[PDB]
Design a protein around this ligand. Structure first.
Ligand SMILES: C[C@H]1C(=O)NC(=O)N1c1ccc(Cl)cc1
Length: 165
């Protein structure tokens, strides 16, 4: 199971880790992807997860979009986890760099409540432009299921833990 995590709350755990390496090690039931509405996994966590699947995540995602159309900001879909997990929960947090409503971050985290346990990144953090401290606060105040957060950046991990209320 998950190891080396700091406990933040009854159900939220955090570790300074590369989510791809963490997923390959744990092979969790669910890995969360920091997806966009088009499931175009170009960069950030999505680009890294997709590259780890040898692009199989992108091939599956293009078929999903061709059939269903784009996701909503704040929405999600469950697809295969490929070699990383049983399932990948593609969750769309608002991208502040595209002028999307930060208020949708709570709706994005609510998707996690449909899964008993998840390995996840902080939604809307990184290239999505939101404040990761705010993302962690919304996470702990929204998610009720067991969420294991992987924060790639050591300096950001330290800032998140030390400023956690
Ligand atoms: C991409 C995001 C993540 O999932 N884990 C991180 O440490 N992230 C990250 C966010 C902001 C900056 Cl400047 C650097 C890294």
């Amino acid at each position: 199971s998950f190891s080396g995590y700091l406990k933040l709350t009854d159900n939220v755990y955090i570790k300074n880790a590369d989510i791809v390496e963490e997923a390959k090690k744990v092979k969790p039931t669910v890995v969360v992807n920091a997806a966009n509405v088009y499931l175009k996994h170009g960069g950030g966590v999505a680009g890294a997860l997709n590259k780890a699947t040898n692009n199989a995540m992108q091939v599956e995602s293009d078929d999903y979009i061709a059939t269903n159309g784009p996701l909503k900001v704040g929405g999600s879909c469950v697809l295969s986890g490929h070699n990383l997990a049983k399932h990948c929960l593609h969750v769309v947090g608002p991208n502040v760099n595209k002028g999307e409503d930060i208020q949708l971050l709570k709706s994005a985290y609510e998707n996690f409540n449909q899964h008993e346990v998840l390995l996840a990144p902080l939604l809307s953090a990184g290239i999505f432009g939101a404040d990761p401290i705010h993302s962690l606060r919304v996470c702990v105040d929204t998610v009720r299921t067991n969420v294991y957060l992987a924060v790639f950046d050591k300096n950001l991990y330290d800032k998140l833990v030390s400023s956690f209320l």
